Amino acid sequence: MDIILGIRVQDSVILASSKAVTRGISVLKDSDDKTRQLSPHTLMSFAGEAGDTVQFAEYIQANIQLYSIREDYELSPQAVSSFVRQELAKSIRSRRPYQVNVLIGGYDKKKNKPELYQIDYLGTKVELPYGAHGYSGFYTFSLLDHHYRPDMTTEEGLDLLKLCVQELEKRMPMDFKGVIVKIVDKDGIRQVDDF
């Protein structure tokens, strides 16, 4: 899977993730959602090797959903990200590691703050105002370095994200078939259906 972006604004986290699923010379699908809801206020996007990506996402989802039932409580985004990192850090020294990179965008209902975590397949975690995995970051980080402000609104975040996706459509060689965008705020997770 190719491009996954994330941006944390004033009161929300926005995750943009490409729709293309290519194998070899054929684009097999152009409407693929590269995300799983882990809990009502925590969303994880993912990209990496075929099979491993979904298998890993669904496995994490299952574990967080089990935690939610057992304790009748939602884990903080910080807690979920630390759980995910440990799973990847365990994975990297396995017989066959999970080749999956992830972004975790969550809204911490206790602190009333949006939070964005970037984690690679080695288990390298970082909290960021904006993140990306793979080649996308080479273009998108310099844009966001220029245009980002911490106090931006969700609409300003979406405009700044359009400017990222346009630059990627201009300068990247692969046709990634546009992006599905999702906003994570105090009211939960919703999909922007027109982008």
Binding site: V21, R23, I25, S26, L28, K29, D32, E49, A50, G51, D52, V54, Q55, R96
Partner: protein, 212 residues
């Protein structure tokens, strides 16, 4: 191999070629690339002949145990995921498998899942898998719409395999057709490319790259 399956107004169409190769050696031209799992489930086969034949036969056994245990027809989503979770356990070992789990249930309606040997599992309306997928995609994508009749859909699938049977060196032999509806699957014949090609040329006025 060339296998396609697509969703439309009046169900699912599934069409496959019938050739097996060992390099440039044509090993057979009368091979069955569709497994009839039950009266409502089909599986297509592309990739390693043994890997497909074995694990899709095994899939049919696991679908039977589900309906004995649960007194209910297995969902296409569940059937496809048994196979995807299986191949994922064998990941890296060198299984070669590209398959399409096509079927109907009341719960989900007509449904197609693409599953392959490196773990990818995808729901969709159109798929073409095999060495000749690109050739089939070309004809299929440019004549497709939900609108299509059962007569036109059956033909388009027949024709999209013929297309790939022609251009792809490793596809051919004959076209096996299936139509899946709410009442189950229906076989729509074995069509030898030897006679079909010349009939389609004459009647359609196509294949003008050929001497005949």
């Amino acid at each position: 191999t060339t296998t396609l399956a697509f969703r439309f107004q009046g169900g699912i169409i599934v069409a496959v070629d019938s050739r097996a190769t060992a390099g440039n050696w044509v090993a057979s031209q009368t091979v069955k690339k569709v497994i009839e799992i039950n009266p409502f489930l089909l599986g297509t086969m592309a990739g390693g002949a043994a890997d497909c034949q074995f694990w899709e036969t095994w899939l049919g056994s696991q679908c039977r145990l589900h309906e004995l245990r649960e007194k209910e027809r297995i969902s296409v989503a569940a059937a496809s995921k048994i196979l995807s979770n299986l191949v994922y356990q064998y990941k890296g070992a060198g299984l070669s498998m590209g398959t399409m789990i096509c079927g109907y249930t009341r719960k989900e309606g007509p449904t197609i899942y693409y599953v392959d040997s490196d773990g990818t599992r995808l729901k969709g309306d159109i798929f073409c898998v095999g060495s000749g997928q690109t050739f089939a995609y070309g004809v299929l994508d440019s004549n497709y719409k939900w609108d299509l009749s059962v007569e036109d859909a059956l033909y388009l699938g027949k024709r999209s395999i013929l297309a790939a049977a022609h251009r792809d060196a490793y596809s051919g032999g004959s076209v096996n057709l299936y139509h899946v509806t709410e009442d189950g699957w229906i076989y729509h014949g074995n069509h030898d490319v030897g006679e079909l090609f010349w009939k389609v040329k004459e009647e359609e006025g196509s294949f003008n790259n050929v001497i005949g």
